[PDB]
């Protein structure tokens, strides 16, 4: 009644020790009740092994305990996957990763770190790389019996880090007497264990002014952090005097970087910056600068935010009728994805698009269609069904008729009784043509009070050439189902005409040489006089039907001969005008790489070769087709070319744009984006200002464009224009939404300040103005 | 009898030590002999510092030894650079670098190393950041009292790397017995000092089938190596079972790799590769992929082999006649160059391009012009000299009329005698206008017996705003030489009027709010009201001048205004109509990528958005312009675009195609291949 549907699978990671032991259940619906068969990466049901692995009830794949030695890697480190199936279908759940890791020792290390007195110190707790995965950071620990854990900063100074460091803000003296130690816990075995080595501060005094320096290798890195966590990105650099830490995040993609804004979600902790509660938003590369009297270093770190894959077929079964089309939508949430992977009945298909659309179903299409979102660490599956439309039944063919022989002379009487739902019409033909009341042929069709069509088809006195393959064809507008069938009529072999067949690059030709008497013994197809098949895309068969492969102008296009001859002597000649048009070849287009902003001028071009005369070029937007009142100049170009032309670009024109172009024969086009952006626009530049002395001055620069711009400030120091260099860094000076927010104004803060407005559409809005001091 | 040229600069690193002290010495040979002037970062002349440095004889600058207490950032850790200079010209060094570092105390820890019996090693030499410039890894030593130095491989096992790390290839148990711990040598103090920790291998026994795994961040890292050396690239990666380690070299920025080629000078050391010999060449995106059984990892290595930045221009010296061209052409050698400047007699120019052209010699031309080519480590400097010419003396003022002030009504008489070969042409303008015999301006110019050219510009009788900022431009076609000056007039302040200012892009827009009256007090320019200084591009002087650096549409084309106004009341206004025009801009083109065959259809697109009305479109092939004999449909779009077609191609239709464009006030143009 119903094909199987998931209702609960395994996790993607199952992880577990040897002396706890592990079960994963998996459980599925349908009707009929579906067994539950486990697989193997590579599509192979996956067996038991005594002691190791067992395959139990329910669809509870079990890994009992065991010893190390016991351990195999076949078992205890393998990608399974749980597949549900009935007779009505198949489905195979997303992957599950078993990892079983035997309970063996490790020792956690803090080594020495050294410090220049003055900076911050990130005392490291060393986990061997191998036990990484299960082994944490949960406390640290000094020889005086001080204990930070995770949360907020200890004495504004002690902070233990979400990955796991000790963060000493402002290293001094007073604190190269501690030893630090590290507390870890085993996330499988449950245990707890300090580190076997005790790291110190070596706080060495500054004499020499020392550049600021970063540890080469950790200049550069990449994290990827779960959902909804505290991120921890540090900024490694040590110098003196005691440097000073900037924080940018650069801008999607772009070599423009805005400076990162600090808040209550996210904190700047002395160089390292805390993000708490990640989003995906987060996710992007940052930059920190350091810099000091002496010079400057800078590091990076590529950030990406997880999200959970979830996913879900639109709709999750329905009923199409035979020809017609099946839509399966893939709907999915979740952060990073990798490759969505459509799959039908356990085995996968070439799809790899969200939407896969079936163009005309039939029998074979029945069943489960799976749509998979994978990535690198997770697998989210969705699953969904067809059923064979019905309750709508389609054309079938019963009394019909069956191969006959003959002499000229009797009255033939060929029967079709076609029944379906709806009551089909029946259609006679005769070797690819189609004959009506003709010449001494009749035909008929009435309905029968059950609700079959039955169709006659009378030939008053089959005549010498009337013989050949005659076929009905019961079509329904739900569908069509044909039969064929020989009739042989004695007489010299007769081969009838054939009407020019128009074939299109790279088509597949099929045409059969329409031969008339039975004595008939050879039939031969003959191109200038050599035998046809001479080549890869020729074929021929003894029945006498030619079929060319991939059609193509210069090398098949010609008159084409078939030859039918009896036994003894007879012989008749047909020819065919196999015509080969050429199918138009569009070129690619390339609007200039700005993109376009709002108020610009576009030229698109559309040139192509083929057909030679008819060539109907149009031009097509997402729906619809160019209303010239919009503001769209479509012009062709002489030996029929085409140039769009759009002045004066505006938002409406924004889109997908396609030159949709059609040549006798043929229909070919071409896609290209329009996206339309918008440069800076002030809305509010700024206000000649002077305040009073110590007054808190809250001066607003804001623009509006799209993208959305950046606003930043700059001052210049002497009382005089052409410096414009970044501000002072100090909580006296902020900027804020744009907002220049200079707390308490010193006496010294008079002078000019310049607000950039930028989004990287066009060259930079500016702003140029004075902010003085009264007394 | 010749400008200065450095025979003897100094190094661009000077590192040394407070107890060792140091001295470096700028040797420059000319005619008149030049004097040596120490120069500091921002152009300043460097001072003397009794006791820490010392300005001496011969041009050389002195560090004498010092007590930490004496040690002063300013002078001890600061970029110095040399200026030799003669009256007749200057030439500043390439930067000095001096880095004084007071022996300080140091001690390098080796620490432990856990390893899963099987997988290679590498012990790490572990230096305080803060001292590695200045300290490197000098040999090994194990507890069993065995030394491991650099060079090549001990017993098939242990090995020294380049970066100073011990790689102990494939670990076993024989090996967790041995303490090793890491000599350094500081290349200043010169002591040599071993490890205050000795590490130690940790060996686990391997049971559980372990992925291949890296120290995350240790993924991906940039090493810069100093040019013919050994080069030491690494891939940490443990697992079990033991890995198996594939070296790839990307292709010069594609995503394409190629597998790297083991031989003789490169060669592969289980994980690690080694690089023998460096050159430029060895530079690129390294990639390393480590798989085995369970799994597979992969790390990355931005290497970049160095090379001696060293400059020369040509030629060293050239004698160019007035109006005539000078060509300057930088040549250098060296890896990576990160900016190609120019520079004339100490202070820079704008031009950032190997080759230096003047267009027109005159005398503020003469001297020396230097080329310096720089990057983040290294600065390589080069040094030329202009000559005048001649025998062919240029135009020159010789009796001018000086600045006045005066009440309106009397006549005045200006007057410029120039002289110069050939006698030059006088001509007389005023706050940049050329006036002629107009209203009751008189202007004459005859020669003098002796072949100077007596020119005057007689007022009739000075109104109240003839006065302003008057100029005798003195041209001649050998160069030219003006002399400008101020007349003021008793009267209301008054603003002449100003004819647009057509400017195009990017272009400085210079221009002077031209008042009249002399009592005149403030002259302001404006901008829709707001005073003008309102955007980076904008300068404005109490002069009444207004200067615009970068010009751009949107930005800056508008009506100023200025306004002129005297003590107590009165005021005028002035309206400046600056216009940017646009110079075309053509878009490039795309031939079908085939190449076109003998017979064929090939359409070329000539698409360009501008300066608006005129446009002026043709094509071009290599010598002359089409005729249409030979079978080429030259054909235009709608709003001034361009389709060139060729239908039935040709052989003679082969060679180089250029759409060529123009616009008032500029020329452009793309060029196409067209192989058949
Ligand atoms: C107001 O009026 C002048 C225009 O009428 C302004 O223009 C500036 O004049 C300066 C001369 O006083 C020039 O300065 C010189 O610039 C050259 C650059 O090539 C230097 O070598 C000189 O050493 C320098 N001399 C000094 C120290 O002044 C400016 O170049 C010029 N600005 C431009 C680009 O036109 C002046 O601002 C001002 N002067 C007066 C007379 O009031
Ligand atoms: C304004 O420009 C000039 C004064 O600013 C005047 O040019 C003057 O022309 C005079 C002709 O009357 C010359 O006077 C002659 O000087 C020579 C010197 O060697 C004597 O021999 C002549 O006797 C004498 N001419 C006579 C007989 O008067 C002057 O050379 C010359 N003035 C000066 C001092 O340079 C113009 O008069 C006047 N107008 C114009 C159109 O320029
Ligand atoms: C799973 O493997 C571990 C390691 O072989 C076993 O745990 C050890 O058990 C022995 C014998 O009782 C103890 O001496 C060790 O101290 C244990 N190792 C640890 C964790 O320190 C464990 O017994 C195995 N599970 C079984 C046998 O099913
Ligand atoms: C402070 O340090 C930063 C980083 O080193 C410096 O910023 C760089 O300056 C150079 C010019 O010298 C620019 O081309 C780079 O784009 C800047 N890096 C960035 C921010 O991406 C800055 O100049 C330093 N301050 C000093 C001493 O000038
Ligand atoms: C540079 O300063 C250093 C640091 O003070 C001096 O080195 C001292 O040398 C004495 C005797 O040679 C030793 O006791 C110590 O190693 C150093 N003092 C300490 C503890 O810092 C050095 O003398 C100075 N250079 C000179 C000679 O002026
Ligand atoms: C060894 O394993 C590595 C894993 O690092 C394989 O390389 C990746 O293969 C995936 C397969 O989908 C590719 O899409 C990635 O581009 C590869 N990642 C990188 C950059 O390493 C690799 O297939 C294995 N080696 C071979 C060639 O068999």
Sequence with gaps: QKGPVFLKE??????????????????????????????????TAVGDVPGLRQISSDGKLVFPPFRAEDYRQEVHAQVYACLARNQFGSIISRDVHVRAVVAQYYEADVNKEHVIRGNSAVIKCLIPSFVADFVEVVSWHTDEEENYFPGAEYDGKYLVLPSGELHIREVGPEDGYKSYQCRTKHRLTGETRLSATKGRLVITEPISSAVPKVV???????KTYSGSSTMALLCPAQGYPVPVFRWYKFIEGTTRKQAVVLNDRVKQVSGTLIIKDAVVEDSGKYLCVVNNSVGGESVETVLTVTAPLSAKIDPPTQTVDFGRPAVFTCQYTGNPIKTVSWMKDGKAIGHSESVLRIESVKKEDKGMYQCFVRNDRESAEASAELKLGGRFDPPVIRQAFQEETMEPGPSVFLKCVAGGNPTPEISWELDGKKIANNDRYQVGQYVTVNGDVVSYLNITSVHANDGGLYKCIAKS?????????????????????????????????????????????????????????????????????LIIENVERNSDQATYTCVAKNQEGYSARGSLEVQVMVLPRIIPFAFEEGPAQVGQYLTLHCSVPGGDLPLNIDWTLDGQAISEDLGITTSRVGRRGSVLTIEAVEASHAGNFTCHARNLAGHQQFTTPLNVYVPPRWILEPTDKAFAQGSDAKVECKADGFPKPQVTWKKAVGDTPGEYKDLKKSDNIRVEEGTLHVDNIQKTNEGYYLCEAINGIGSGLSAVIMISVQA
């Design 10 to 43: 395994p996790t993607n990671r199952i992880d577990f020790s040897n002396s706890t032991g592990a079960e994963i259940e998996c459980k599925a619906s349908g009707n009929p009740m579906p067994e539950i068969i486990w697989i193997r990466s590579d599509g």
């Design 477 to 545: 507008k739900v569908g069509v189902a044909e039969h064929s069938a020989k009739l042989n009529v004695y007489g010299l072999p007769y081969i009838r005409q054939m009407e020019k067949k128009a074939i299109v690059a790279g088509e597949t030709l099929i045409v059969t040489c329409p031969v008339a008497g039975y004595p008939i013994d050879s039939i031969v197809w003959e191109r200038d006089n050599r035998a046809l098949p001479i080549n890869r895309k020729q074929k021929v068969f003894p029945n006498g039907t």
């Design 216 to 222: 080469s290798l950790a200049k550069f890195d990449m």
